[PDB]
């Protein structure tokens with residue numbers, strides 16, 4: 413299991429009493445109530461000392477937000493989750509972005525959960541503790557004291573089940589983030605709801621065959637963990653680094669790479685952010701797709717697993733070859749789509765023909781083909797006997813496997829150079845053989861760019877492009893919408909080949 417943040421034997425060495433006497437802003441905090449334990453009134457200054465006057469002011473506001481959450485009606489959480497969590501969002505946004513306020517926040521939560529007379533309030537503070545642990549840790553100056561506080565809470569008698577469950581889940585999520593590294597976003601409402609109730613976040617991942625897979629994750633769950641989990645659950649090879657699958661984000665059809673160490677919950681936050689930014693129009697999916705094409709089979713692995721992987725991939729490739737950015741050959745699209753129809757629907761009927769327009773779009777033909785070559789399609793379809801599902805499927809897979817773009821990681825690009833020979837719009841098709849420049853207009857490979865020519869620790873890229881070095885030492889500045897995908901593909905193929 414995960415390494416302890418603090419051993420049981422060190423619990424007695426790290427007492428918050430000592431931390432608080434040495435670090436609290438005692439003079440400026442002078443008040444009626446005890447400064448070191450629960451109080452119902454606002455604090456008159458920050459708990460810790462901030463040289464930045466603005467951070468002192470914000471620390472005081474944070475405390476008001478803590479009080480507000482502690483005192484809020486359980487009914488708001490159901491009727492208006494956005495309102496219910498607003499004070500939480502304020503706290504976590506400040507702490508995540510401003511490292512020098514993190515210990516302040518934790519000290520306020522320790523304080524408000526110390527000698528807290530009312531059980532329901534103690535429960536609210538421990539929910540806050542758990543939200544905070546799920547977002548950022550205390551700094552190295554406080555973390556051992558806070559960890560001692562957690563373990564003491566977990567190990568001693570007292571606290572309701574709710575406080576103890578929150579404390580245990582808080583300690584564990586701190587361990588998970590120590591393992592998986594920092595996150596980048598404040599929890600969405602959906603995540604906070606799960607954290608509050610001490611349960612996993614449930615996410616739905618779409619597979620290439622359109623099927624819906626469920627995963628139970630936590631705040632620290634990475635793309636790599638979830639990609640491995642989905643692989644194992646689909647009975648593929650269990651290591652996504654071997655099978656080459658990852659989970660990507662899809663917003664209204666536009667796909668973006670998710671890095672292996674990136675947190676899926678951070679993607680959920682972005683979704684919520686966009687929903688607000690657009691004020692519905694948000695068609696978001698996670699998608700489980702094949703990213704990397706390694707020649708690493710056997711490794712004497714069950715062919716059964718390799719087979720599940722390959723079926724997911726055929727759906728992906730078929731769909732990509734229906735994408736005009738990758739393929740413009742109507743004859744070809746007709747040939748694969750007509751076989752797919754024979755497989756799924758069997759022999760032609762006038763009832764099928766009457767069903768196609770609109771329905772078959774993206775499934776058996778492209779809109780372009782529904783408009784300019786329907787009859788040509790209906791004709792190729794009629795042509796297939798008699799074809800058994802087995803034969804129909806085998807022929808389709810053959811046509812797919814022999815396409816130039818089969819078994820390549822695909823990236824849509826453009827360039828603006830006046831001294832390079834390629835067309836403005838091209839595809840980079842990356843595989844173990846190199847970085848291939850492909851022209852989707854003619855279905856031809858134009859050049860095979862070498863991984864061995866790229867800078868190993870200084871690959872040049874920006875927000876919109878990656879600069880790839882050609883054999884003659886000139887640079888192709890490939891513009892692409894998903895720069896991270898292109899950069900990571902170059903790095904991952906290079907590393908694989910190195911080993």
Ligand SMILES: [Cl-]
Nearest residue numbers: 434435436461
């Ligand atoms: Cl001081």
Ligand SMILES: [Cl-]
Nearest residue numbers: 462463464512
């Ligand atoms: Cl400061």
